[PDB]
Design a binder for this molecule. Sequence first.
Ligand SMILES: Nc1ncnc2c1ncn2[C@@H]1O[C@H](COP(=O)(O)OP(=O)(O)O)[C@@H](O)[C@H]1O
Ligand SMILES: Nc1ncnc2c1ncn2[C@@H]1O[C@H](COP(=O)(O)OP(=O)(O)O)[C@@H](O)[C@H]1O
Ligand SMILES: Nc1ncnc2c1ncn2[C@@H]1O[C@H](COP(=O)(O)OP(=O)(O)O)[C@@H](O)[C@H]1O
Lengths: 490, 740
Amino acid sequence: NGPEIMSKLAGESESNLRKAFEEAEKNAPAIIFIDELDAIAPKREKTHGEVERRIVSQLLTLMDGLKQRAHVIVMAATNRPNSIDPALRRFGRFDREVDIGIPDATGRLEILQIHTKNMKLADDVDLEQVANETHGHVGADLAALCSEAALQAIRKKMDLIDLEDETIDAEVMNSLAVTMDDFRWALSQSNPSALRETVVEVPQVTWEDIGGLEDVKRELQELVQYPVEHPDKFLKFGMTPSKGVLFYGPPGCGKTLLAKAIANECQANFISIKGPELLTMWFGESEANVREIFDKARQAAPCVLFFDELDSIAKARGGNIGDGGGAADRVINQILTEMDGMSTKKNVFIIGATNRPDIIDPAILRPGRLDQLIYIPLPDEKSRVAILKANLRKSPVAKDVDLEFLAKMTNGFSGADLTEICQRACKLAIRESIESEIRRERERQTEEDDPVPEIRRDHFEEAMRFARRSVSDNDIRKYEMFAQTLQQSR
Amino acid sequence: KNRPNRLIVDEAINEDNSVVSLSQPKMDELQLFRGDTVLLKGKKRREAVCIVLSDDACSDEKIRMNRVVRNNLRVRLGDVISIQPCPDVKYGKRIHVLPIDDTVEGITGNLFEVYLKPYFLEAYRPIRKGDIFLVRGGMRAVEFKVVETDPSPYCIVAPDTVIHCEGEPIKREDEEESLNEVGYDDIGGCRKQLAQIKEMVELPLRHPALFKAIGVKPPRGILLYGPPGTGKTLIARAVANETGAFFFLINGPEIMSKLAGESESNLRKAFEEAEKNAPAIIFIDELDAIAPKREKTHGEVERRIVSQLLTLMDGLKQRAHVIVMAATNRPNSIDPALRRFGRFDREVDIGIPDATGRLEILQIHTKNMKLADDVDLEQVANETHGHVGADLAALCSEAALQAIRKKMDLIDLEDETIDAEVMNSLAVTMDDFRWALSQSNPSALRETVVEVPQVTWEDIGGLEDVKRELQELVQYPVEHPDKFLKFGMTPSKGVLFYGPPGCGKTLLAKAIANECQANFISIKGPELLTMWFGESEANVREIFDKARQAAPCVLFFDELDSIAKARGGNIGDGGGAADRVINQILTEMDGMSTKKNVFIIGATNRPDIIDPAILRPGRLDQLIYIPLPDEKSRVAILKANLRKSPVAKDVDLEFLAKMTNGFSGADLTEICQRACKLAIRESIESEIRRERERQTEEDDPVPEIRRDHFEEAMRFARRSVSDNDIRKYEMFAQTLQQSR
Ligand SMILES: Nc1ncnc2c1ncn2[C@@H]1O[C@H](COP(=O)(O)OP(=O)(O)O)[C@@H](O)[C@H]1O
Ligand SMILES: Nc1ncnc2c1ncn2[C@@H]1O[C@H](COP(=O)(O)OP(=O)(O)O)[C@@H](O)[C@H]1O
Ligand SMILES: Nc1ncnc2c1ncn2[C@@H]1O[C@H](COP(=O)(O)OP(=O)(O)O)[C@@H](O)[C@H]1O
């Protein structure tokens, strides 16, 4: 381990580093595990002392004295790959790199089952709730969560009931169940999640959730799945695959939803890069770390990179006019340079998105880059009904709700606004239920409990008064004006 | 004989060293009345005699007793005792008490007539042989042990029984501790922080054997941080003394002042010594001096010291009987290799006390000062905004030293040195505190304040629909989230108050933070402009981190459009939407824990120039328009602002409301304050006239603001808001669901 080597004197740290390798080579086959590698061998300029460089060189020459032996394997642990001396990450020394990374809902459920394996939980505790409510926790936090939950479940009772008794009884200790509220307490407070990192996983929205756009389904399925399934046809006909799409359209019609769905069906990871992230990299003026993202993509292949709000840099730089009025910027140039010079077949599929398709610089849709432009249209009646029922599919709804009349009534509304209508109708329903809870709580003396958990037509027909058209007519018109600049009428 | 006589000790609210407080169900169950002498048997065949009184905030197994009787019974807080009622003697014969040599040093004169004389007057208190009690006075606390009790073993106060006690200081027995040490009672403020530390170290330190019968890892790294001078070492000493664990103290400079090998040896010796005497606490204070940031280690020996501390902290996962607490100043000032799981995983923020906490600290330090009656500690506690515990300690010491330097030293002319009874006859004045608090005490605070505010719903005038909307948006979810789960709706975690300047946005947010009984972190407009101008927008994340260290909170990002309004407003710097700090606010808001009860509230005076990416769903999006107040609300505004000032009957608030229209509440408060200014000026003219009497009881300066002041200062009323302001506000309203 790193600190233990750096806590000794110079010659003695050299001797321990030598002794470890020779001892482990004596007892072949062996594994040597050096953890906290970035403490023992940091970056070159970060070695302010002299003894540090001698320790790094000693580790280097021992690692190069191991090409003779085939019975020793050396595994090391770091925090990020660009945090150690680049002389170590070369062929013959440290050539395989494995990224452990963050678990997901299934993985978090796995870890919680590991740590509560002998805890004697009650029946009401639902680990799925916890696993869905621990977004941003890694294994050590879940271990701390389980230990803290047990300690809460031993501090509030059955210690201050041990009054007649002096110490813990075995059978008493076994009779310790935990509640869902105990987990709600431990998970609510005192556990700061240790994650501000980008998440890479298989998403959970599927094709049944997006409403409509079935031609776009049979196009995305083609563009993503057709090549990677069976590339023999592409070889017989000699066509390179397209490694990009550019969704352009009005704001809030399901671009993110569509990309997450096509990442779901393909059963590949999904690295999302928001708009604020691009603005952060432009404002701090450190556009270098963009390459890191792509590197991360190649460490988690296959992926669907989703460069959402790709025009945000342009729209923040005066939009049409401002700063001379050129085309390219820092981060978009770096995206071009990283996209062009990447491995032509890894199943890494870059997907853009934009709300203003004209202000994006024309050098991005030249062939060999993301070029297969797809216009996401404003949803219509047969798709509006699907949108509405898919969003209501998680909420109770009665029979008198006329989704046909709802569709016919609302036109030129984006799906985001319809979801706003649904959620605000549910908000009014929630408010009505809390008024019913206060009335039936304020009983005459203070089993007719049912708060009517069914959202009646009144809520929808009242919250429909708060429906607002987020999209004008000239929006659709300039979108058609961009459409005619494509193969439709030109 | 087990059931009625077992309860657990806890903290006290009363200050008398003889009263024990029990809840009402137990005292009617136990068949006990007020005043009854009762007896407590504890550990190690020890006894305690006590008068009992009634209290409210307890359960049916909790007993509240002060530290003196708690140490008299040889038990500690959180343990169990046995409680039996006895019959009363209702007299005494000849008691005898002795002083302790450890407490009495440099006391001249006799201790009897000055201390024991006023103590047993009209307060019937029972005592037992062999106890230890404490008396406060003359800026000291003196211990007294009862040696001989003539009529019974336990005898109540009885003024016929004089005290014959003229003896030498008796040697304090070496197994028992003094009561001038530190305990939970000797820490003012920090109720929540003591709650967290007391629940964190109850089981490993009180019940060590329990953690040999289960595989469960208790937390072993605790990191205390807060401003310097907030008494962090004091908390550790307290917790050590109250759990009875061994306390070792390492400090930063002392380790860095030795040679290399010897600093390594002391750091090793401390851990092995404290591990020998389990259960123990190791307290390393000034952690940021012994283990700073990586790039800030210019030497080589520093890195060896940090690595030695690291490998000792990782050699402690085997042992469960050692806890390591450290103290720093801010969490991002130490090596990030320490703030990881297994080494320093729990972090506690002490922080600044508030008015109640400052009152607590001032009561702690003036506990034996013999103040006069006119001094009002509430005035001081309201007038010490920006002081932490060390400054209040310096304030009390400086006030006492002022109250001993201007008189009764230069009256000691015939006398040579200080007399005991003379020293006891030292009262302090409110003016003395005004002097000490006015000058020579630079407050050591430029930090953001986090606390529960003090304005309430009765102060804002009008806007009752906005009350029943904010109550919904803030309180509805956190009260009972079951309904939201049945209907599957995510809570809204934001509001955006938009409206004219000075109609009570800050007041409204502070009120909704008050009723919810949550902290309130305010982020002004100048702060955003500072972070944009210095171009260090990174530390915005720190603010949010602070929010999650003080949860629940109400972040109030006041003047959210100030960055835009300083960047040319409508036109300037190309003319985009987003800026640095607002982007950083989006990135920190989106990627935060979706349920912590951290509620972000914006505010703005120009709702159109704010960039449209902030009110997209999943962020602050529930826009609320704060309207210009009307008649029924103007009267409420006016009476609420006048509610702290004397006002007569002839003031026509109805005519005042009808007369002033299109005026924002800020301007009406300006009218009120300027009317009071004219009233003050008139009163000073009356004071000069009646001071310039004919020879130089008709004193009354007429402390009643007549109608003349209001009707004259009403000539200086100015409309801060035009008509086109209200019109473009309605133009923003029609861009919402009203008419679109
Ligand atoms: N076809 C659709 N099916 C289901 N939900 C949709 C659909 N279109 C939009 N939504 C709603 O819109 C939101 C996604 O908006 P999105 O398209 O990501 O915005 P943007 O275009 O700014 O990226 C989701 O909350 C979702 O509820
Ligand atoms: N909450 C508090 N209650 C009582 N005293 C306090 C409190 N906060 C600070 N003080 C006082 O301020 C001082 C804090 O300084 P510090 O350096 O922590 O003390 P120490 O001398 O123990 O290292 C102590 O003298 C303590 O009496
Ligand atoms: N409804 C109200 N009730 C009581 N006081 C108010 C009210 N509205 C405004 N005030 C006065 O206005 C001031 C607060 O102004 P504020 O709304 O914070 O300004 P801004 O809108 O620039 O943030 C306070 O001094 C308060 O006296």
